[PDB]
Write a protein that binds this DNA or RNA. Structure first.
Lengths: 55, 67, 77, 191, 142, 141, 100, 19, 144, 56
RNA sequence: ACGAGACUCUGGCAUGCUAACUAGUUACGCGACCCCGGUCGGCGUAACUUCUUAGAGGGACAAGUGGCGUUCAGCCACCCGAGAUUGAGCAAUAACAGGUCUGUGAUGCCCUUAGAUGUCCGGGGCUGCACGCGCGCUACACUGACUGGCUCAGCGUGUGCCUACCCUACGCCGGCAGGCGCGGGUAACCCGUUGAACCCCAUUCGUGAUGGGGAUCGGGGAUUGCAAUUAUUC
């Protein structure tokens, strides 16, 4: 029954069901506007997306 | 405090030296003159240069200046 | 440093009613707080008594507010 | 048809400022007379612009303190209005004349400042400014009325009214007169 | 014939009150109701202050309809009382000779400046590390 | 010429409540005695005839802005929810009280149904508000 | 026909240049054209901590992304609209045409 | 197209694609 | 009227507890344990007594009327969700309980929990916080 | 107009160091640092560790 | 030469310019109510940008006046004026054994690698309690608590990639927490004219650990989720 008990735990929700699209770390996710990155990868890749600091 | 830096003073000094006859004591007239005879990227720098040109004109009208 | 624990009565007895009827219309400034302080009565009782004398015509109303009401005496002449 | 500016229902003329050193720090006569003690403001921007503010507006501004009353200007306005009505109904006098006399008699004229290092106790008596006299008078009257109206059945609109009545005579039953005389005695003790 | 109409606004913080002065008998209404039925009633003198300052004879040839939207309560009252004065000044200044505008404007400025000039005071932006614009959180040592 | 807007609404709501009480055709519900008007309230209303005042205020709000439904009526009569230790917030009122007030005003010939949502006023209802406003203005003058 | 052309971009200067080019083409083609209606801009604010760890003073970053949107109406058949939109387009400006 | 996501998400997805 | 009436009782002995007559009748019976501020309004609304009257000047007929209303809630059109003890674990009926009965019911409920040896009964027997909150910092005055 | 090169890492030893080669003209502050200088950061994988490159 | 300044964003104004049925104003007609006029965010179409929205430009520079100053750099006050010091962003050389190997398919060396320190499932712990400390929330009341009425905003966000999970008007049922049918919005179009709170008006309360304060504790009823006991939330 290893084929049925390999992934039997539900992952429809929670922070383990989400992941970064760059480094796949489940901490500090940016779910606003569907970036779905961590904050460090967002600061690394923020300039070429279009986000700039003016305020 | 309102102290002009060296860029404003050098620009106003070479404006007084190089274009002198087409000037005056009016701030707006030599403001437009400094607008057309030079290239200033901003507007606050233009107004500060024009104000120092007006002050230098008022100083030249009383006597010579060693710059 | 005297405590003097307060006991403000809720309903008027025989004597406090007629001392009120002989002293309150002879007061320059009439307020429920000051008549409750002077006669050692409860605040709602003071408001009820001043409303009763306002209906009786012995009390002249000046200003009415949700925080306080101000009353004054009538002229002697 | 503004003949005179009635302060709600009170005249702004025929009032006397007895102290000659406070003639231009009490703005009540013929220039700074408004219908209400609420204005837009812009008095705390410059260095001496607060002296031209009217004294009843300054009283309403300094009335609201102690956390739970900050910003509530309208409530202080109606408490000051009811206090003025009670003062006129009690003494039979103009409420502005009682307030002006309460400013003059409750203002200290000599103060002792602390000198020396941090920890020692030593005072030196100096005289005070006419503006600071007005500020100390307003602050003392306001905090005296506030302390008098606490955990008591007596409302603050008549506690402030009895505050200005006792201060105008110098009867020493008010907090402001007592603190003024305390400051004068401490200043006079070591001149 | 020709129709006389001016339309002047007024602001204090964010509230905008726009008046409308045209010909007619003397009546002043803001948001469809007169000046007496505007809450709070403790600023009714602030509402009626330019009318009491200029008299009812100057307002008898006009009628005033103010629409107001935005802001709070006190800012709305100040915007209305600025806009009424500005609309009357503009109506007099446009159609009547401006000498009469000068004896309106001099006494209006001589009483209080905010009847015709707006107050340029806006809210300061909040900064991080503190609960408000300038205040900071409590610092702990050791 | 008098409307409801050039007169104080505070005495106007009370006079309209007295008029609907004198009419006696409002069909007052059964659980009026044991009800809390909102979840952020603590005690019952002090007066036993608050339903007439609530119906009068609902009719006045429908006159000032039509098309208001049950959820728009719930947002108007909201208040501050003191949660004790927790910081306070804003909470809406009770929906069934608003539905019973609006259904009473529908059963009376005063309030009809606005198109595609909400409720509005019958011209007979606007007549009743104008006559009550005229009576209030005549009493106040 | 009621033809609506929507332009949404991030830069403002290239957007104004291509809007000027389109309104100049509409003016030189001599047809009824509505003016450039300027919708209110939208800002995308993401506020995040600067440090990757949890050490240092609590400093924060403020990122923004301004979005400008215009719409200009025309009264013409469709082929004129396509031949006037497929001329000298800018890379940073999106063009999007529908008919009601 | 039936999905046609919002104007914010369009520029977001375009920036993610370029990055 | 405003003058105090004859035989104004100063105290009351409703359910063997002292109840003063100076407090409001909507709030003097709040001092009875098991009846609070909200419960006192419904009892005085089903019964025809105005809530603007005092406590020590009401008469024995309406006193015994509201007393029988308090011991018998449900038979006077009081809804079942207004009760402090709904669906009891022993007899299974809706019954509002009063002071000494409330103490007895709480005591036997804690005794039942200790007898069945649940976690809630064990924490109640130990004398700690049972609702599941942090006890690292708060709750310092439990012992010395 | 001018450039600087920064190379940081374990440069010939156990303890890391950094060498900076500045000559010419290099602005640092304000809006014109955005569109006058060009900044690139790269990492070098050698046999002893990681070496960084900062060029402007 | 760098740093400062200079630069960028935002706020404060222009009845002048450019255009708005996804924003309005003013006239006109229809419609409803009152006693000849007033009200309508009720309905519709003849101009316009006064409100709103956002583009180019303008405006402030110590410019004018009077004093102080080598009469130089500058300072003070005043008049006209929406402003005569708006708030932030960026931010030099040299270093700290500062924090991060637990952000990374960034990584040297060392350890382990099939009875695993990889991975997966089930249960538990991260909350546990004689005590100490820090950032905080609510209060100690009558400038107040409760109960009704009246009335006023701006930043935002919103149907998702493997990804399932959006914001809600309206109608019915129930005190309430909530449940069921119907429609809208991929958005200045719909929630929404965001009927927000503090305030304002009017009752009840009366200095009492009290109608202040709501800790602790018992019973019942709903929603999320595969699962709530160590009480998820209400």
């Amino acid at each position: 029954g290893h084929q049925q008990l390999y992934w039997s735990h539900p992952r429809k929700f929670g922070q383990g069901s989400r992941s970064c699209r760059v480094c796949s770390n489940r901490h500090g996710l940016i779910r606003k506007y569907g970036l779905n990155m961590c904050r460090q990868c967002f600061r690394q890749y923020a300039k070429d997306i279009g986000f700039i600091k003016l305020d | 405090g309102r102290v002009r830096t060296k860029t404003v003073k050098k620009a106003a000094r070479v404006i007084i030296e190089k274009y002198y006859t087409r000037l005056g004591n009016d701030f707006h007239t030599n403001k437009r003159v400094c607008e057309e005879i030079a290239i200033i990227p901003s507007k606050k720098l233009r107004n500060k240069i024009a104000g120092y040109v007006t002050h230098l004109m008022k100083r030249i009208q009383r006597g010579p200046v060693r710059g | 440093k005297v405590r003097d624990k307060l006991n403000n009565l809720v309903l008027f007895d025989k004597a406090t009613y007629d001392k009120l009827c002989k002293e309150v219309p002879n007061y320059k400034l009439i307020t429920p707080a000051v008549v409750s302080e002077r006669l050692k009565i409860r605040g709602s009782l003071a408001r009820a008594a001043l409303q009763e004398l306002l209906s009786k015509g012995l009390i002249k109303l000046v200003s009415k507010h949700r925080a306080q009401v101000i009353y004054t005496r009538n002229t002697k002449g | 048809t503004p003949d005179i500016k009635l302060f709600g229902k009170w005249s702004t003329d025929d009032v006397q400022i007895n102290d000659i050193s406070l003639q231009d720090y009490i703005a009540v006569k013929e220039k700074y007379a408004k219908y209400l003690p609420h204005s837009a403001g812009r008095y705390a921007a410059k260095r001496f612009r607060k002296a031209q503010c009217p004294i009843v507006e300054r009283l309403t501004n300094s009335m609201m303190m102690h956390g739970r009353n900050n910003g509530k200007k309208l409530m202080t306005v109606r408490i000051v209005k009811h206090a003025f009505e009670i003062i006129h109904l009690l003494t039979g006098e103009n409420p502005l004349q009682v307030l002006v006399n309460a400013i003059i008699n409750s203002g200290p004229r000599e103060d002792s400042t602390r000198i020396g290092r941090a920890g020692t106790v030593r005072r030196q008596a100096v005289d005070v400014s006419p503006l600071r006299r007005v500020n100390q008078a307003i602050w003392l009257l306001c905090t005296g009325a506030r302390e008098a109206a606490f955990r008591n059945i007596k409302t603050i609109a008549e506690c402030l009214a009895d505050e200005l009545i006792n201060a105008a005579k110098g009867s020493s039953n008010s907090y402001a007169i007592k603190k003024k005389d305390e400051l004068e005695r401490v200043a006079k003790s070591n001149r | 014939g020709p129709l006389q109409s001016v339309q002047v606004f007024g602001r204090k913080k964010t509230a905008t009150a726009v008046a409308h002065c045209k010909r007619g008998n003397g009546l002043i209404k803001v948001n469809g109701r007169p000046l007496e039925m505007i809450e709070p009633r403790t600023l009714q003198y602030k509402l009626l202050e330019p009318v009491l300052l200029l008299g009812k004879e100057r307002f008898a040839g006009v009628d005033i309809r103010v629409r107001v939207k935005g802001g709070g309560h006190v800012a709305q009252i100040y915007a209305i009382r600025q806009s009424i004065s500005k609309a009357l000044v503009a109506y007099y200044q446009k159609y009547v000779d401006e000498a009469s505008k000068k004896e309106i404007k001099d006494i209006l400025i001589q009483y209080d400046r905010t009847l015709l000039v707006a107050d340029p005071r806006r809210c300061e932006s909040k900064k991080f590390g503190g609960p408000g614009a300038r205040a900071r959180y409590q610092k702990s040592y050791r | 010429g008098v409307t409801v807007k050039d007169v104080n609404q505070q005495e106007f709501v009370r006079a309209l409540a007295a008029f609907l009480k004198k009419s006696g055709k409002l069909k007052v519900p059964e659980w009026v005695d044991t009800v809390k008007l909102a979840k952020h309230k603590e005690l019952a209303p002090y007066d036993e005839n608050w339903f007439y005042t609530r119906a009068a205020s609902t009719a006045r709000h429908l006159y000032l802005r039509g098309g208001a439904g049950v959820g728009s009526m719930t947002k108007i009569y909201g208040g501050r929810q003191r949660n004790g230790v927790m910081p306070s917030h804003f909470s809406r009122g009770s929906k069934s009280v608003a539905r019973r007030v609006l259904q009473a005003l529908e059963g009376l010939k005063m309030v009809e149904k606005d198109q595609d949502w909400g409720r509005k006023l019958t011209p007979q209802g606007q007549r009743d508000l104008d006559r009550i406003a005229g009576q209030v203005a005549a009493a106040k003058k | 026909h009621r033809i609506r052309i929507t332009l949404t971009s991030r830069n403002v200067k290239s957007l104004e240049k291509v809007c000027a080019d389109l309104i100049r083409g509409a003016k030189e083609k001599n047809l009824k054209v509505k003016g450039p209606v300027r919708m209110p801009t939208k800002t995308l604010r993401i506020t995040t901590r600067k440090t990757p760890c949890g050490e240092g003073s609590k400093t924060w970053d403020r990122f923004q992304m301004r979005i400008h949107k215009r719409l200009i109406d025309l009264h013409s058949p469709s082929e004129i609209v396509k031949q006037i939109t497929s001329i000298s387009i800018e890379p940073g400006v999106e063009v999007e045409v529908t008919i009601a | 197209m039936a999905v046609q996501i919002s104007k914010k998400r369009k520029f977001v997805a375009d920036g993610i694609f370029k990055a | 009227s405003l003058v105090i009436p004859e035989k104004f009782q100063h105290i009351l002995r409703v359910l063997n507890t002292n109840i003063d007559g100076r407090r409001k009748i909507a709030f003097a019976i709040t001092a009875i344990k098991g009846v609070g501020r909200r419960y006192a309004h419904v009892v005085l609304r089903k019964a025809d007594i105005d809530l603007t009257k005092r406590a020590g000047e009401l008469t024995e007929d309406e006193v015994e009327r509201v007393i029988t209303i308090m011991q018998n809630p449900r038979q006077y059109k009081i809804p079942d969700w207004f009760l402090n003890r709904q669906k009891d674990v022993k007899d299974g009926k809706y019954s509002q309980v009063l002071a000494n009965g409330l103490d007895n019911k709480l005591r036997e409920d804690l005794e039942r929990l200790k007898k069945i040896r649940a976690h809630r009964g064990l924490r109640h027997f130990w004398g700690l916080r049972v609702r599941g909150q942090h006890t690292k910092t708060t709750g310092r005055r439990g012992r010395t | 107009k001018g450039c600087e090169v920064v190379v940081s890492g374990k440069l010939r030893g156990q303890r890391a160091k950094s060498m900076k080669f500045v000559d010419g003209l290099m602005i640092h502050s304000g809006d014109p640092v955005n569109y006058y200088v060009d900044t690139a950061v790269r990492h070098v994988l050698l046999r002893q560790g990681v070496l960084g490159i900062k060029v402007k």
